[PDB]
RNA sequence: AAGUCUGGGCUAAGUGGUAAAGGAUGUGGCGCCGCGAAGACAGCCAGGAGGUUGGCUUAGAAGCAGCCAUCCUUUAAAGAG
């Protein structure tokens, strides 16, 4: 649900140097702060592959401090398919725009016939307060031939939440 | 096989294969992909050779995405002529592909099937490739 | 998972003597010297011989298993001894002993006569079973093999020399 | 590590329902002779307990971790454990020990048995139903 | 031809080409007129002459009794 | 013996062996024998 | 399962069983079948003996009314 | 002409000292899953059985021609193969 990941500070160390030694250069920020950091590459991957940009990672800083953050952006090295840098958004109590998973609670009538349900949205953008961050967002999918579909306007929307996309958006 | 419905220009300078892809470097549609390991002009006939192999392996089933398009006209002079007397004739179309580009994606199909089908597709392409699956990293993009 | 470290029982009364790069195994049925890597330790314990190796590197692991079996085979050789049986199959095909020698009639123009190497005994209990016996195992395996090659088992008919226990697999003629 | 423990509880549950659970070597029979002993130790008692057939490894954990004497008769060899007190046995060990010592060469011999709570014995358990 | 309760008698070359003989029961030989043109692409032929009668397997021998 | 640049197991009984500097496939089924080359 | 033909409205099954029903039976009319061939089988029940006939039900294409 | 110099490592092809897709239990070193002293992997001694030829088919296809269906049973376990 909530993940921990050890993070450290950097100044002048070259990214290529860090990157060489198994560390992922990165940065943490929010309206109030902005700090150059790095986390260990393999430790991060273990976490990120569960977290994604969905759940809160919390950063155990050397100083003792413990920031609750969302991953905001992950740069890839195009040529090697690997992360070169991460952007850690430090959560406060203010609302925050974010991506929340969609779980399609159901089985298709269009599939099981002669079909393939391309689901165009794995998740959905959503204005929300950090103390109210979901895990799921449930989607009724009893009937969907090839090809009908829904547009997020028809989404359950828990208490605390607020669609951050035009409700004309296909899921 | 693919080519532009229309072009603003019939023929175009050869240009150059430097660099990793500008974009298209992450999975965006399916679950599995095939990424270019080397730069090359992939040709329309080559792409379709790959497409068809995939469809044959699925027995019509599943969905296939083709993420490169041949928009670059390939020129050739007639056999046995000398140099000069102007640029040759367009003999077909190619897509310029640089390493990191995801060329095809598959969806709605088992892991074994995406695997084999992407493997095979590779064998029709004149470059090294690697098969990939969707990650956190693609969704973050 | 291991053959190199397996201890080799040694019957009363066969005697294993050790030297550098050779072990002499003597028993009721004769004696064999067994060449052995200079790199393995052959160890004589009570009614048992062990073999040891000085590392876990690949070449050493290999010689280990090999070496114990090489010795275990010599040990068995001089007490029990080895034999192999060939079955002769087919309408005109019969074997016979001519003195020490084995005569095969297997559908050639001539008959085939086979002299035994030293350390090898041939028996023909019936005219369609031949038996090769001796202390040296690979020697036995070899003479047995040679013999079989004179007229290998046919692909289409139960015809030719057969290893006892060799299954008769056949394809359809026409 | 592993679903061998949703089997530790099985033979701990249905061994926590006895005091005279005997044990035999139920193997050498075909599938005809299998449903022989099976419906005939199901017809020489109550419920449906002939043997439960479970690992000598696990069954010795059960007989050790529920005190039950540790039925150290002979856990080695094929072991099926004729739960004679998940049925109603008594001289129904005759109903087994003779039907086995009839069909085929030594059909279903025994090795362990707890008498009410105290250990029985080897052939003093074939003679305990004669 | 073995799907029509047939027994092969032999095969010999011809105009190259190649011919086959078999004892097929007539009772399984209706379709074989067109069924032959369907396998050889209108390039094979046949002749068909009676030879003998015999006792059919008891499966039909006690099924045709109807 | 098949002789190819691509030697592969053809069936679950096939076996990839390396003798004397060459890779062979060897098998119950004689059609499956391969040598690289 | 010879007996299941004289109790559903069928001489044959339903070609492709599952979606296509060409007859039916109740939870009590599966138990009655479970009755006649009960001395044949293995299990000596009727909640067990009938699920063997509630499965030779889709082995042809007849639903069991519940 | 000047080191058969020093230390760590790899290579067994004379690779070094002629090339690609691709193939591979070559070798050495990483990483990640799975199983394992409640006994795994390898061999080997059992068992792998019922309703049942499953139905429809075809001349016969009885687990295995081919369309279908694929339930349950006694079970430690056993596919309508
Ligand atoms: Mg990745
Ligand atoms: Mg990585
Ligand atoms: Mg140019
Ligand atoms: Mg972009
Ligand atoms: Mg070209
Ligand atoms: Mg022209
Ligand atoms: Mg030109
Ligand atoms: Mg290629
Ligand atoms: Mg010997
Ligand atoms: Mg020879
Ligand atoms: Mg072999
Ligand atoms: Mg000099
Ligand atoms: Mg030197
Ligand atoms: Mg050289
Ligand atoms: Mg060279
Ligand atoms: Mg390697
Ligand atoms: Zn093979």
Short mmCIF file of N, CA and C in Angstrom, two decimals, chain A residues 24 41 44-45 48-50 52-54 71-83 115-116 118-120 122-123, chain B residues 19-23 25-27 29-31 35 62-63 65 99-100 107-108 130 132-141:
data_model
loop_
_atom_site.label_atom_id
_atom_site.label_comp_id
_atom_site.label_asym_id
_atom_site.label_seq_id
_atom_site.Cartn_x
_atom_site.Cartn_y
_atom_site.Cartn_z
N UNK A 24 20.76 5.84 -8.98
CA UNK A 24 19.92 6.57 -9.89
C UNK A 24 19.85 8.04 -9.46
N UNK A 41 19.84 1.99 -7.66
CA UNK A 41 19.05 1.61 -8.82
C UNK A 41 18.20 0.37 -8.61
N UNK A 44 15.34 0.77 -6.01
CA UNK A 44 14.26 1.58 -6.57
C UNK A 44 13.38 0.80 -7.50
N UNK A 45 14.01 0.07 -8.40
CA UNK A 45 13.28 -0.73 -9.35
C UNK A 45 12.34 -1.71 -8.65
N UNK A 48 9.52 0.69 -7.47
CA UNK A 48 8.79 1.31 -8.56
C UNK A 48 7.93 0.35 -9.34
N UNK A 49 8.40 -0.87 -9.54
CA UNK A 49 7.62 -1.84 -10.28
C UNK A 49 6.36 -2.25 -9.55
N UNK A 50 6.10 -1.66 -8.39
CA UNK A 50 4.87 -1.94 -7.67
C UNK A 50 4.13 -0.64 -7.49
N UNK A 52 4.77 2.38 -9.21
CA UNK A 52 4.51 3.15 -10.43
C UNK A 52 4.32 4.61 -10.04
N UNK A 53 3.44 5.30 -10.75
CA UNK A 53 3.14 6.70 -10.44
C UNK A 53 1.80 6.78 -9.68
N UNK A 54 1.46 5.65 -9.08
CA UNK A 54 0.16 5.42 -8.49
C UNK A 54 0.19 5.58 -6.97
N UNK A 71 6.01 9.50 -7.33
CA UNK A 71 6.86 9.59 -8.51
C UNK A 71 6.12 10.46 -9.53
N UNK A 72 6.84 11.42 -10.10
CA UNK A 72 6.24 12.38 -11.02
C UNK A 72 6.67 12.15 -12.48
N UNK A 73 7.86 11.60 -12.67
CA UNK A 73 8.44 11.56 -13.99
C UNK A 73 9.63 10.64 -13.94
N UNK A 74 9.75 9.73 -14.89
CA UNK A 74 10.94 8.89 -14.94
C UNK A 74 11.55 8.98 -16.33
N UNK A 75 12.71 9.61 -16.45
CA UNK A 75 13.43 9.63 -17.73
C UNK A 75 14.05 8.28 -18.10
N UNK A 76 13.77 7.82 -19.31
CA UNK A 76 14.45 6.63 -19.84
C UNK A 76 15.65 6.98 -20.74
N UNK A 77 16.64 6.10 -20.78
CA UNK A 77 17.67 6.15 -21.81
C UNK A 77 17.11 5.35 -22.96
N UNK A 78 16.63 6.07 -23.98
CA UNK A 78 15.99 5.48 -25.17
C UNK A 78 16.71 4.27 -25.73
N UNK A 79 18.01 4.42 -25.91
CA UNK A 79 18.83 3.39 -26.52
C UNK A 79 18.95 2.09 -25.70
N UNK A 80 18.91 2.19 -24.37
CA UNK A 80 19.11 1.02 -23.50
C UNK A 80 17.88 0.55 -22.69
N UNK A 81 16.77 1.27 -22.80
CA UNK A 81 15.57 0.99 -22.02
C UNK A 81 15.84 0.86 -20.50
N UNK A 82 16.25 1.96 -19.89
CA UNK A 82 16.67 2.00 -18.49
C UNK A 82 16.44 3.40 -18.01
N UNK A 83 16.16 3.54 -16.72
CA UNK A 83 15.89 4.85 -16.11
C UNK A 83 17.17 5.66 -15.92
N UNK A 115 -13.18 -11.83 -29.75
CA UNK A 115 -12.71 -10.48 -29.49
C UNK A 115 -11.53 -10.26 -28.56
N UNK A 116 -11.07 -9.01 -28.52
CA UNK A 116 -9.92 -8.59 -27.71
C UNK A 116 -10.17 -7.20 -27.11
N UNK A 118 -9.11 -4.25 -25.85
CA UNK A 118 -8.15 -3.17 -25.67
C UNK A 118 -8.74 -2.22 -24.64
N UNK A 119 -8.07 -2.10 -23.49
CA UNK A 119 -8.44 -1.10 -22.51
C UNK A 119 -7.44 0.03 -22.56
N UNK A 120 -7.89 1.16 -23.10
CA UNK A 120 -7.03 2.30 -23.42
C UNK A 120 -6.53 3.06 -22.19
N UNK A 122 -5.31 2.38 -18.38
CA UNK A 122 -4.90 1.56 -17.25
C UNK A 122 -5.30 2.28 -15.97
N UNK A 123 -5.33 3.60 -16.05
CA UNK A 123 -5.67 4.45 -14.91
C UNK A 123 -6.40 5.70 -15.37
N UNK B 19 21.82 8.55 -33.99
CA UNK B 19 20.98 8.77 -32.83
C UNK B 19 20.10 7.61 -32.40
N UNK B 20 19.66 7.67 -31.15
CA UNK B 20 18.60 6.78 -30.68
C UNK B 20 17.29 7.36 -31.20
N UNK B 21 16.17 6.66 -31.03
CA UNK B 21 14.94 7.17 -31.61
C UNK B 21 14.63 8.50 -31.04
N UNK B 22 13.87 9.29 -31.80
CA UNK B 22 13.47 10.59 -31.31
C UNK B 22 12.46 10.24 -30.26
N UNK B 23 11.54 9.35 -30.62
CA UNK B 23 10.46 8.99 -29.74
C UNK B 23 10.06 7.57 -30.04
N UNK B 25 9.82 5.24 -27.90
CA UNK B 25 10.75 4.39 -27.19
C UNK B 25 10.11 3.52 -26.10
N UNK B 26 8.80 3.66 -25.91
CA UNK B 26 8.07 2.91 -24.89
C UNK B 26 6.77 2.36 -25.44
N UNK B 27 6.31 1.27 -24.81
CA UNK B 27 5.09 0.57 -25.16
C UNK B 27 3.93 1.49 -24.85
N UNK B 29 0.36 0.72 -26.15
CA UNK B 29 -0.89 0.15 -26.60
C UNK B 29 -1.05 -1.27 -26.17
N UNK B 30 -0.12 -2.12 -26.59
CA UNK B 30 -0.24 -3.52 -26.24
C UNK B 30 0.42 -3.89 -24.92
N UNK B 31 0.82 -5.14 -24.80
CA UNK B 31 1.40 -5.58 -23.57
C UNK B 31 2.82 -5.95 -23.84
N UNK B 35 11.41 -4.10 -29.89
CA UNK B 35 12.21 -2.90 -30.09
C UNK B 35 13.51 -3.09 -30.94
N UNK B 62 -6.30 -12.09 -31.48
CA UNK B 62 -5.40 -11.07 -30.93
C UNK B 62 -5.44 -9.73 -31.66
N UNK B 63 -4.75 -8.73 -31.12
CA UNK B 63 -4.58 -7.43 -31.78
C UNK B 63 -3.08 -7.04 -31.96
N UNK B 65 -0.30 -3.92 -33.17
CA UNK B 65 -0.08 -2.51 -33.50
C UNK B 65 1.21 -2.33 -34.25
N UNK B 99 17.70 2.83 -33.00
CA UNK B 99 17.63 1.94 -31.84
C UNK B 99 16.74 2.48 -30.73
N UNK B 100 15.94 1.62 -30.10
CA UNK B 100 15.07 2.02 -29.01
C UNK B 100 13.62 2.15 -29.45
N UNK B 107 -1.39 -7.47 -28.33
CA UNK B 107 -2.29 -7.40 -27.19
C UNK B 107 -3.29 -8.54 -27.24
N UNK B 108 -3.86 -8.88 -26.08
CA UNK B 108 -4.91 -9.88 -26.01
C UNK B 108 -4.57 -11.24 -26.58
N UNK B 130 14.90 -6.84 -29.66
CA UNK B 130 14.61 -7.52 -28.40
C UNK B 130 13.13 -7.36 -28.12
N UNK B 132 10.02 -6.94 -25.51
CA UNK B 132 9.80 -6.26 -24.22
C UNK B 132 8.33 -6.35 -23.74
N UNK B 133 8.12 -6.24 -22.43
CA UNK B 133 6.76 -6.23 -21.91
C UNK B 133 6.51 -4.91 -21.19
N UNK B 134 5.25 -4.50 -21.11
CA UNK B 134 4.90 -3.25 -20.47
C UNK B 134 5.27 -3.18 -18.98
N UNK B 135 5.72 -2.02 -18.55
CA UNK B 135 6.19 -1.85 -17.19
C UNK B 135 5.63 -0.60 -16.66
N UNK B 136 5.90 -0.42 -15.38
CA UNK B 136 5.80 0.86 -14.70
C UNK B 136 6.40 1.95 -15.56
N UNK B 137 7.54 1.64 -16.16
CA UNK B 137 8.31 2.64 -16.85
C UNK B 137 7.56 3.16 -18.06
N UNK B 138 6.72 2.34 -18.68
CA UNK B 138 6.01 2.80 -19.85
C UNK B 138 4.82 3.63 -19.46
N UNK B 139 4.26 3.32 -18.31
CA UNK B 139 3.04 3.99 -17.91
C UNK B 139 3.35 5.36 -17.35
N UNK B 140 4.56 5.46 -16.80
CA UNK B 140 5.08 6.71 -16.28
C UNK B 140 5.33 7.78 -17.37
N UNK B 141 5.32 7.34 -18.64
CA UNK B 141 5.75 8.17 -19.79
C UNK B 141 4.75 9.23 -20.32
#
